[PDB]
Amino acid sequence: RQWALEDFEIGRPLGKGKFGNVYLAREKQSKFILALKVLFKAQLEKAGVEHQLRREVEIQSHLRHPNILRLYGYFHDATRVYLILEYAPLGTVYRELQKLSKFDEQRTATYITELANALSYCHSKRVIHRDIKPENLLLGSAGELKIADFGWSVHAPSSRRTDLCGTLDYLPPEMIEGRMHDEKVDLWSLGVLCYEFLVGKPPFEANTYQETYKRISRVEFTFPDFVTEGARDLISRLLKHNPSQRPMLREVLEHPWITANSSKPS
Ligand SMILES: CN(C)CCOc1ccc(-c2cc3c(NCCc4ccc(NC(=O)Nc5ccccc5)cc4)ncnc3o2)cc1
Numbered sequence: 001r002q003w004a005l006e007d008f009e010i011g012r013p014l015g016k017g018k019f020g021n022v023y024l025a026r027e028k029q030s031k032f033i034l035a036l037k038v039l040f041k042a043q044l045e046k047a048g049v050e051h052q053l054r055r056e057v058e059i060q061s062h063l064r065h066p067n068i069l070r071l072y073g074y075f076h077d078a079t080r081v082y083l084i085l086e087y088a089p090l091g092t093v094y095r096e097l098q099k100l101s102k103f104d105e106q107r108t109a110t111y112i113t114e115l116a117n118a119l120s121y122c123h124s125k126r127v128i129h130r131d132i133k134p135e136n137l138l139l140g141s142a143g144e145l146k147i148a149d150f151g152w153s154v155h156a157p158s159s160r161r162t163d164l165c166g167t168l169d170y171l172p173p174e175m176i177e178g179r180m181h182d183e184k185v186d187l188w189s190l191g192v193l194c195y196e197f198l199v200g201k202p203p204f205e206a207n208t209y210q211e212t213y214k215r216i217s218r219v220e221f222t223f224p225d226f227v228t229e230g231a232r233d234l235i236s237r238l239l240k241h242n243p244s245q246r247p248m249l250r251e252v253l254e255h256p257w258i259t260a261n262s263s264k265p266s
Contacts, residue, residue, distance in 0.1 A: 001075070002075065003075040004077075005075055005082070006071050006146055007027055007028055008028065009026045009028060010025050010036065012024045016201070018039045018166065019047075021037070022035055022038075024087065026034075030143050034087065035084070035088070036082050036084060036229055038080055038082055039053065040081075041080055044081065045092050050150065052249075053083075055081075055151075055155075057073075059127055063120065063127070065117075065118055067144065068122075068146060068147050069088060069138055069146040069147060069148040070085070071086075071150075072085065081122070085173060086146075088146055088148075090139030090140065091129050091139055092134065092135060092137060092139070093111070093139065093145065094136035095097055097205060103197040103198065104230065109257065109258050109261035111145050111197060111204060112125070112197075112252060112258060113258060113266060114144065114145040115145060115190060115193065116253050116258075117253070119147075119187075119249055120249040120250065123183045123186070123224065127155070128154055129153050129185075129189070130152065130153060130171075130185055130188050130209070131152040131153070131163070132186060132189035132190070132192075133169070138143075138149045150174045157180075158180075158181070159178075159179070167209070167212065169205060169212060170189050171216070172185050172189070172243070174243060175251075176213060176217070177217065181243070182233075184243035187246040188239065188246060191237075192233070194234060194235050199223075199227065204216045204220070204221060216251065219239055219241045221239065223235075228257075233255075233257065234255050234257050234258065253266035
């Protein structure tokens with residue numbers, strides 16, 4: 001069924017994104033509340049990212065998981081392209097970090113568990129995210145974490161180009177150095193998130209791209225005193241330069257700190 005802009009009532013601006021804005025919207029006939037992301041054709045093609053948007057839709061048509069944000073469909077008109085998205089009422093984990101500053105071990109462990117499950121499902125369909133970050137983590141009505149943005153995802157064990165513009169904070173060494181990568185990139189991203197959730201800033205943060213680059217490359221991070229031994233263990237196991245030294249997602253779910261602190265099952 002072909003969608004058009006006049007099928008929806010557009011509402012509150014939900015977020016300002018790199019490639020476009022997200023708005024709340026309601027389908028007129030059903031009164032179905034959802035989110036519409038408006039991306040501009042001109043800009044998408046000028047950046048050479050037009051085909052990646054097609055691949056996201058492709059990948060999202062094959063994904064069904066409670067911790068992954070649904071993409072219901074897409075359409076376009078004279079100047080832009082629209083993603084029809086599941087609406088996540090409690091907003092981004094990004095905003096939640098700003099509000100709360102940092103998360104306790106219980107909330108962190110629960111988010112890592114939900115992430116791990118979502119990513120474990122993705123890797124079993126051979127899909128790897130490559131863009132994991134708090135902006136792309138959304139919260140459903142029960143506060144359940146939902147992964148968004150598969151615009152930078154890849155089909156197979158590949159070595160394709162991700163967004164090296166924008167911060168490098170969540171990208172692993174093998175991606176920033178233009179090396180061949182695989183599903184292990186997502187486990188690095190987990191480690192970076194686990195650190196950020198507990199600390200309030202990501203482990204390789206710097207006010208310069210060039211310094212953040214060097215820090216990721218050296219795997220140069222330190223823990224504040226309030227970060228517990230168990231968390232330090234998990235994070236340290238995830239943030240390994242060599243991809244193959246990083247654990248499997250099921251080891252993370254079985255990690256004693258996760259099981260002791262997570263409120264949600266694996
Ligand atoms: C105070 N506050 C907690 C109250 C509630 O506030 C909010 C705030 C935001 C939301 C919100 C944001 C949001 C949202 N944001 C968009 C997430 C997203 C989706 C798709 C993509 N994909 C993409 O950009 N792909 C791409 C890009 C360029 C080239 C190719 C592909 C990226 C990000 N999506 C769905 N539902 C949503 O709900 C909800 C409540």
